[PDB]
Design a protein around this ligand. Structure first.
Ligand SMILES: CCCCCCCCCCCCCCCCCC(=O)OC[C@H](COP(=O)([O-])OCC(O)COP(=O)([O-])OC[C@@H](COC(=O)CCCCCCCCCCCCCCCCC)OC(=O)CCCCCCCCCCCCCCCCC)OC(=O)CCCCCCCCCCCCCCCCC
Ligand SMILES: CCCCCCCCCCCCCCCCC[C@@H](O)O[C@H](CO[C@H](O)CCCCCCCCCCCCCCC)COP(=O)(O)OCC[N+](C)(C)C
Ligand SMILES: CCCCCCCCCCCCCCCCC[C@@H](O)O[C@H](CO[C@H](O)CCCCCCCCCCCCCCC)COP(=O)(O)OCC[N+](C)(C)C
Ligand SMILES: CCCCCCCC/C=C\CCCCCCCC(=O)OC[C@H](COP(=O)(O)OCCN)OC(=O)CCCCCCC/C=C\CCCCCCCC
Ligand SMILES: CCCCCCCC/C=C\CCCCCCCC(=O)OC[C@H](COP(=O)(O)OCCN)OC(=O)CCCCCCC/C=C\CCCCCCCC
Ligand SMILES: CCCCCCCC/C=C\CCCCCCCC(=O)O[C@H](COC(=O)CCCCCCC/C=C/CCCCCCCC)COP(=O)(O)OCCN
Lengths: 347, 105, 303, 98, 99, 113, 129, 171, 83
């Protein structure tokens, strides 16, 4: 498209998210969600193909259903108390409607089915945007009303999301579907600590966004969307594969990498509330995510796969376009564990 | 999450529309305006937990005004008992309630 | 006696449509250096009755495979809307007095496209469907500018009440305050009813014809009330009724004149006419008529 | 909460269930979202009028507008999908899978 | 009550007349023997719809002129009309109004 | 060319001036009507209060007659904790009255056209 | 009582929603939704919302159900909760709706920006290529 | 919770003003000019007490004063008033403008008979002051006592003792 | 200047509708900020009493508040009458 129109649409998406974040009226939050959805579709359809159109229509159907459910929750809450301010709901039914709408918007299980398909259909930059920026508004709304949520429902959906992400990632050869299932598992981790501490939710969100940005920019740099395409990168850019392996190790939650910071903290927080069984199951299930991250690392950087003859020509050229923030993203996603107490900044 | 830009800048982007008793055009009064004003003045600055536990009387009155469920229950009970008595035949409505009264301006 | 009032509003409108057919034929004939129907009846006055009897006796050609429900519903909706839109109008006293009478008329006009859509879809022909799509697109396109012009003009009336238009124009006609909007409104009402030069398209056929001519008379009466305000004396409303009827008749004869005077547009040509000449001027004059009462401290009373 | 509110709520629930069925004809899915928004408009208008909350008389119209804008986009999407297949069937959108 | 009765009378008369028209000639015996989907019509329909949404917002303009805040109301009305004009201009310059 | 545009602008200005005068006169007439309503308002308020109180007392008397056999009923018991006067609901005034005037008080203004 | 006209209107509303929720022959579903919209407009008008009912009936029906039908053709207990006082010499609904410009500047800004972006988005999506 | 107290039917009995709205509109300007003091007493009491049961005697007073006003009208110029109201009653909108001549005749008659001057434009809408001896209600809303606020602690900040104290971190 | 004059003359030919629309819209934007009758319109809107004017309780320290509408003190509408 035209760069002016693309920039306008990106700023409209950001302004919708911002509208959701800064407003105190439920109508304005709904309007921000509508603005975000309206400006998000052409970004998903920036490169025209049938798969992108299918992904965009599935995404629109899901998000529009979620928006209608959210407005139903708002109107019921207004009916049982003539209040428009985003605060504790005051109605049991309204809270459930709101929780399901936000779970559908976030992609939490059992509303996860759209995330892998939409991520696979759209390009890598669209997937980066969808998996990073599109989680801020629903999570901010959830943080604002965390005192209202029924812990049973939120924790059930969190554990279901972790299990579904772990199991669904094991069966994937496509990199975008792997990222989608990883995002589902990380959302499950994020929403299990909302009833207890929203600061841990925000810390997990920030760490996950950093790692996802690094991984997507590495996948864009070495333009691969499959396992076998990524297996060719060592024969041109071995340093990229090494950085990707370290980032994958971090995403699996291994100490002393940055990815260990959230789960640890979250587990720690959940222990202060006499919740022992649930964090144990969450860690055991995160072992599945680690397994398929390790399989990707085996296929990419820890072993040398066969190459082709035409690769020689690619040896004579270098990238024209570069990401300025990719080194910073890699460093922030691998080596910030010593700076953990800085989480007191209420990030 | 919530970045309170309006409070920092003093903008009032959407706070004019949040409650019944906030400066309606032409000073039109909300049906539950008195009840909401009392509930708000009870719960100001106290915090959500203490507001929920301590201002329950005002919120109950505000809710009742808004939905009138208890008034509906009482009116239905009165009508049902009156219907039972008229079916039994030991009660007769006065001329006022039959439309035979003398209306006043 | 409300039912008697409803009948006294409905039956005369249908009679007026029936004799408007004869009036149009005779006017076109005399404009074409000939006579109109002057044989059936002393002065052609029995011609509409003969046409109605012939149409109601002739076999109806149901397509034998078309959607029966919509094939019947479309003329019902057409007649119902055409007869309903006369209720809001004040001549001088309206049968039904509405606060938002103008908005009600606009909503009825917006509904009127469903008959076109359903009749086109029922015919079970690709060409008929294409023609119906042309008609629907033209109708919605021109009702846009009808609505915008209407609100721009009403910004001087003070409300959506149709009776207040009589009070607004007690001294001067609204034609002098805004003639350009009236010109664009006249062209848009021509386009809305599919009258020339915008006419690109047994029993039920007569029903559609009656609905269309009823909408023609109704639109002309609406224009007369909106832009040519007749003086009303509360102790003798017959003067207002006669004056309003004469203005409506003049506007209808002006439609006949325009039909007899000009060739017709192409579809793309009238699309371009609207979307590139009326809408820009309509928006500009809407801004102007928003600003004018505030600039001149001439805001109408009601709020 | 009287019977009219429950009738409108069950209308919204019926529309939501009909949307979640997906027999075929994605146009029907759009129609179901549309009935959902219509029920939302009706019930919000009833609540706002009953409580005499003068300012929120704005928000039904706004809701309509925004929802209507959404409808437009959906139609576009539907149209484009048809341009690939010649029909708006739901079962044609199976290129992307879990 | 008056409006409902008037609507019922109008619909009843239309129905009676259409059925008598459809059955009067049925008493006497007689012989009794695609794909294209042009894109421009959808676009004009969508433009009408987008414009229609803009029309609703203004609808309250006749009442908006009595507020004592004439400056703010005038500014917002002109802003809405300017954005409608900008929508028209954008669709014009991008070949959205062509056949 | 110039003359036709000049004629159009001139008639526009004439219409603007005439409607300016007429609309200012209409504003003054509306202010006069509002003043008359303001002058009449206190009597209407007194009559409204007295009518509402009479209807409430009649309903209370009928409730006292009817509820004599209900064990736990208290005649004229409020449903609000507050002692503050609450504007009566429409069903409280016309609950025991005839259907015709219930429909009147409910839909007379809405249905009157 | 007129046998609860509001209740029967709500019942017809629910029946129409059931009618088009089965999704038979999307033209028939559209017509069922049109009937449901008319009934809901009747509900709002009978409640007292004249302007909002007419907004439903004009914008909703005459524009967007019309566009849905166009696109489809191209392809293959009451009376109790009410008030006691009056409004004055004006209608509260109109004043509140009217107040958006004076009070709702933020709403106007966001809605206008959203509609302009929607026009741009529609053209970009339907561009093709 | 409690019993709602209502005045008896005898307390609500008053000599009523039994003239139609056309007569009232015809007389409205002079009525507002003449019967102003009881009306303002009643309306000030009505917005201060926020209770119909606390304003009944003032309503009786305004009824009596309106009756006195109409008795004066009846005694001196019944015919001029009757002609003027006939005109007001005819019009459906009851517009003052429609029958200016009738109003002029009525105005002349009252001034000569009662020296009454019709209030000008913008006078009856003025906000005026009322000399009343009724006490100002100290708790018109019948509110409860507001709950005690939170302690609102204050002090001078010192560094956190032994740092963050988070796991093995010494700062 | 010269190029602007050439552009306006070239647009006034073959595009008169757009020129007229832009001129009318620009006037509608600019003129209200310069008219001296806008404040008169605001004052007229302020002088329209939709609600009952609630009297104030006299406390012996309100000289500018009238006791009767006929009293000289209080807002006047002679500017409105002369208009
Ligand atoms: C990797 C390391 C790269 C180089 C970094 C250099 C400093 C390293 C500090 C790391 C710890 C930061 C910290 O939080 O310190 C507080 C604290 C030490 O502060 P302290 O005990 O007051 O300082 C004692 C010094 O003797 C008191 O020192 P001082 O106050 O005299 O400081 C002078 C300054 C001297 O400055 C320079 O020399 C500048 C030139 C170099 O210190 C130094 O630069 C030399 C060290 O550290 C801890 O509490 C324990 C941290 C344990 C590790 C972090 C947790 C995770 C462990 C594994 C992480 C794996 C990461 C991914 C792989
Ligand atoms: C994985 C590394 C992530 C790094 C994050 C990006 C780094 C670049 C950011 C650029 C500078 C950010 C500072 C923003 C300037 C003004 C900040 C102000 O606007 O916000 C204040 C607060 O700012 C932020 O809270 C501080 C952000 C600092 C984040 C660092 C902590 C991350 C955990 C430790 C990991 C190690 C990272 C350090 C190595 C770089 C007040 O917020 P408040 O309106 O009152 O409430 C909203 C938050 N609530 C709802 C949770 C209460
Ligand atoms: C200050 C920060 C600037 C940079 C950040 C900008 C963020 C995006 C831009 C949009 C935000 C603009 C802020 C306007 C908020 C409206 C509220 C404030 O401005 O006051 C209003 C003032 O309104 C004025 O009209 C402001 C006019 C500004 C709007 C016109 C143009 C806006 C365009 C902004 C972006 C829109 C799309 C892009 C266009 C290019 C209310 O006036 P008033 O009547 O006293 O008070 C009402 C209360 N009453 C009833 C008790 C009296
Ligand atoms: C009730 C009153 C009725 C008034 C109208 C009666 C009609 C008389 C008979 C003639 C009508 C016959 C109908 C046939 C359709 C004719 C439509 C038509 O052709 O108009 C087109 C025409 C031009 O299009 P084209 O020539 O094709 O070229 C454009 C592309 N370059 O469009 C227009 O010009 C529309 C303009 C309408 C009038 C507006 C003129 C106003 C301009 C200056 C006004 C200034 C006022 C501003 C405020 C003043 C402040 C200082
Ligand atoms: C067909 C049009 C239906 C609505 C007609 C009237 C709409 C209207 O604006 O006025 C309603 C009229 C007057 O309103 P105001 O102008 O505000 O003044 C009265 C106060 N003095 O009063 C009413 O509300 C009467 C009607 C209310 C009850 C019935 C409403 C209609 C219900 C229709 C249901 C059938 C729908 C069928 C499907 C429709 C699909 C096209
Ligand atoms: C500050 C006021 C703003 C608000 C007023 C405007 C409201 C409504 C008007 C705007 C509507 C949208 C306009 C969209 C512009 C597109 C024009 C366009 O692209 O047309 C060009 C041609 O038109 C142009 O030349 C572009 C605009 C030309 C200038 C028009 C007037 C500009 C300003 C003139 C006056 C400015 C102020 C007054 C100065 C005069 C002295 C008072 C091509 O025409 P086609 O039909 O596609 O093909 C024809 C070739 N075969």
């Amino acid at each position: 498209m035209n760069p002016i129109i693309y920039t306008t649409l990106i700023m409209t998406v950001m302004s919708g998210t911002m509208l959701v974040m800064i407003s105190s009226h439920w109508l304005l939050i709904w309007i921000g969600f509508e603005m975000n959805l309206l400006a998000m579709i052409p970004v998903l359809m920036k490169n025209f193909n049938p798969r992108a159109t299918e992904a965009a229509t599935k995404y629109f159907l899901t998000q529009a259903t979620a928006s209608m459910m959210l407005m139903m929750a708002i109107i019921i809450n207004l009916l049982y108390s003539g209040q428009w301010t985003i605060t504790k709901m005051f109605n049991p039914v309204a809270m459930t409607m709101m929780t399901m709408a936000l779970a559908m918007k976030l992609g939490l299980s059992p509303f996860h089915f759209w995330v892998p398909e939409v991520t696979q259909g759209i390009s890598l930059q669209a997937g980066l945007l969808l998996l990073t920026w599109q989680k801020l508004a629903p999570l901010s709304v959830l943080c604002q009303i965390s005192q209202s949520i029924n812990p049973n429902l939120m924790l059930t959906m969190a554990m279901l999301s972790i299990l579904i992400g772990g199991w669904g990632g094991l069966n994937q050869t496509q990199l975008r579907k792997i990222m989608a299932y990883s995002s589902i598992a990380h959302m499950g981790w994020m929403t299990a600590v909302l009833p207890y501490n929203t600061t841990m939710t925000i810390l997990n969100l920030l760490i996950y966004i950093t790692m996802t940005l690094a991984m997507f920019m590495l996948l864009i740099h070495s333009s691969a969307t499959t396992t076998l395409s990524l297996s060719h990168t060592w024969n041109k850019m071995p340093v990229i594969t090494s950085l990707m392996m370290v980032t994958l190790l971090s995403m699996g939650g291994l100490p002393p990498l940055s990815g260990f910071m959230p789960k640890w903290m979250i587990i720690q927080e959940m222990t202060k509330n006499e919740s022992i069984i649930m964090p144990t199951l969450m860690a055991m299930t995160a072992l599945l995510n680690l397994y398929f991250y390790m399989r990707l690392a085996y296929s990419s950087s820890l072993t040398m796969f066969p190459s082709t003859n035409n690769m020689k020509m690619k040896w004579q050229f270098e990238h024209t376009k570069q990401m300025k923030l990719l080194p910073t993203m890699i460093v922030l996603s691998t080596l910030v564990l010593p700076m953990t107490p800085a989480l007191s900044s209420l990030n | 999450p919530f970045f309170d830009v309006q409070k920092r800048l003093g903008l009032d982007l959407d706070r004019w529309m949040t409650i019944q008793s906030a400066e309606q055009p032409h000073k039109i009064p909300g049906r539950c305006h008195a009840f909401e004003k009392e509930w708000i003045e009870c719960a100001h600055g106290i915090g959500g937990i203490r507001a929920e536990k301590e201002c329950k009387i005002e919120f109950d009155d505000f809710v009742e005004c808004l939905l009138r469920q208890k008034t509906m229950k009482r009116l239905s009970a009165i009508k049902r008992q009156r219907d039972k008595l008229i079916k039994e035949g030991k009660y007769t409505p006065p001329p006022h309630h039959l439309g035979k009264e003398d209306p006043r301006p | 006696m409300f039912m008697i009032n409803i009948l006294s509003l409905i039956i005369p409108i249908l009679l007026a449509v029936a004799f408007l057919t004869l009036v149009e034929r005779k006017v076109l004939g005399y404009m074409q250096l000939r006579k109109g129907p002057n044989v059936v009846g002393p002065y052609g006055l029995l011609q509409p009755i003969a046409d109605a009897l012939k149409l109601f006796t002739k076999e109806p050609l149901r397509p034998a495979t078309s959607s029966i429900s919509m094939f019947i519903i479309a003329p019902i909706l057409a007649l119902s809307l055409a007869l309903t839109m006369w209720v809001p109008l004040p001549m001088p006293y309206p049968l039904i007095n509405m606060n938002l009478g103008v908005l009600f008329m606009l909503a009825m006009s917006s509904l009127a496209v469903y008959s076109i859509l359903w009749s086109g879809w029922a015919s079970n022909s690709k060409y008929a469907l294409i023609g119906a799509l042309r008609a629907v697109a033209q109708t919605i396109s021109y009702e846009v500018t009808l609505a915008i012009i209407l609100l721009s003009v009403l910004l001087m009336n003070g409300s959506y009440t149709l009776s207040t238009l009589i009070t607004t124009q007690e001294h001067i006609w609204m034609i002098f305050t805004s003639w350009p909007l009236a010109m664009m409104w006249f062209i848009s009402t021509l386009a809305e009813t599919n009258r020339a030069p915008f006419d690109l398209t047994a029993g039920p056929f007569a029903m559609f014809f009656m609905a269309e001519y009823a909408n023609i008379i109704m639109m002309n009466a609406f224009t007369a009330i909106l832009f040519l305000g007749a003086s009303h004396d509360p102790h003798t409303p017959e003067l207002y009724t006669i004056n309003f009827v004469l203005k409506t008749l003049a506007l209808t004869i002006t439609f006949l004149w325009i039909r007899a005077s000009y060739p017709r547009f192409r579809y793309d040509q009238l699309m371009h006419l609207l979307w590139k000449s009326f809408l820009p001027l309509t928006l500009a004059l809407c801004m102007w008529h928003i600003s004018l009462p505030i600039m001149t401290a001439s805001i109408p009373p009601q709020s | 909460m009287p019977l009219v509110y429950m009738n409108i709520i069950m209308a919204f629930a019926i529309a939501l269930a009909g949307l979640l069925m997906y027999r075929s004809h994605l146009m029907s899915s759009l129609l179901c979202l549309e009935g959902m928004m219509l029920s939302l408009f009706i019930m919000s208008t009833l609540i706002i009028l009953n409580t005499h909350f003068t300012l929120a008389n704005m928000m039904p119209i706004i809701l309509l507008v925004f929802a209507a804008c959404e409808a437009a986009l959906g139609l576009s999407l539907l149209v484009m999908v048809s341009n690939t297949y010649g029909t708006d069937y739901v079962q044609n959108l199976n290129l992307l899978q879990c | 009550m008056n409006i409902m009765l008037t609507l019922l009378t109008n619909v009843t008369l239309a129905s009676l007349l259409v059925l008598i028209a459809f059955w009067l000639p049925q008493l006497n015996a007689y012989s009794e023997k695609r794909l294209p989907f042009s894109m421009k019509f959808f676009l004009v329909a969508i433009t009408f719809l987008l414009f229609d949404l803009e029309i609703a917002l203004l609808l309250p303009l006749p009442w908006a002129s009595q507020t004592n805040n004439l400056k703010t109301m005038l500014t917002m009305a002109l802003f809405l009309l300017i954005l409608l004009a900008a929508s028209l201009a954008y669709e014009w310059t991008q070949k959205g109004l062509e056949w | 060319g110039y003359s036709m545009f000049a004629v159009g602008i001139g008639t526009l200005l004439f219409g603007y001036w005439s409607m300016m005068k007429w609309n200012r006169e209409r504003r003054r007439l509306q202010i006069e009507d509002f003043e008359a309503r303001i002058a009449l308002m206190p009597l209407f308020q007194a009559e409204k209060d007295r009518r509402v109180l009479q209807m409430l007392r009649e309903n209370l008397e009928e409730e006292a007659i009817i509820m004599k056999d209900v064990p736990d009923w208290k005649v004229g018991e409020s449903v609000f904790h507050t002692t503050r006067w609450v504007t009566p609901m429409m069903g409280e005034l016309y609950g025991l009255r005839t259907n015709e005037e219930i429909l009147s008080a409910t839909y007379g203004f809405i249905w009157y056209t | 009582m007129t046998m609860y006209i509001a209740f029967i209107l709500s019942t017809i509303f629910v029946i129409g929603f059931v009618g088009f929720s089965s999704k038979p022959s999307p033209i028939y579903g559209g017509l069922g939704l049109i009937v449901s919209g008319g009934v809901g407009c009747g509900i709002v008008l009978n409640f007292g919302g004249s302007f909002l009912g007419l907004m439903v009936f004009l914008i909703y029906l005459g524009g967007m159900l019309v566009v849905f039908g166009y696109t489809t053709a191209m392809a293959t207990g009451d009376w109790v909760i009410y008030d006691t006082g009056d409004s004055g010499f004006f209608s509260e609904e109109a004043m509140g709706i009217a107040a958006l410009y004076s009070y709702g500047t933020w709403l106007v800004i966001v809605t206008g920006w959203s509609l302009l972006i929607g026009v741009v988005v529609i053209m970009e999506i339907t561009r093709g290529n | 919770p409690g019993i709602v107290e209502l005045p008896t039917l005898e307390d609500l009995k008053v000599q009523e003003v039994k003239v139609s709205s056309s007569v009232l509109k015809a007389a409205a300007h002079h009525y507002g000019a003449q019967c102003d003091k009881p009306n303002k007493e009643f309306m000030l009491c009505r917005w201060e007490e926020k209770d119909p049961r606390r304003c009944l005697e003032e309503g009786k007073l305004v009824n009596q004063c309106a009756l006195d006003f109409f008795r004066q009208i009846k005694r001196h110029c019944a015919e001029p008033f009757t002609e003027y109201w006939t005109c007001i009653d005819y019009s459906g909108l009851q517009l003052f403008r429609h029958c200016r001549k009738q109003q002029a005749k009525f105005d002349e008659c009252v001034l000569d008979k009662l020296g009454w001057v019709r209030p000008d434009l913008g006078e009856l809408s003025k906000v005026t002051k009322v000399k009343t001896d009724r006490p100002l209600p100290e708790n018109p809303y019948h509110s409860r006592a507001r709950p005690e606020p939170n302690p609102e602690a204050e002090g001078d900040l010192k560094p956190a003792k032994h740092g963050s104290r988070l796991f093995f971190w010494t700062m | 200047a010269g190029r602007i004059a050439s552009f306006l003359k070239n647009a006034w030919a073959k595009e008169p509708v757009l020129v007229a629309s832009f001129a009318i819209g620009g006037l509608a934007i600019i003129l209200p900020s310069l008219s001296p009758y806008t404040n008169y319109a605001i004052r007229i809107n302020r002088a329209t009493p939709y609600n009952y004017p609630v009297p104030l309780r006299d406390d012996g320290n309100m000289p500018d508040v009238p006791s009767h509408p006929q009293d000289p003190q209080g807002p006047s509408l002679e500017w409105l009458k002369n208009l």
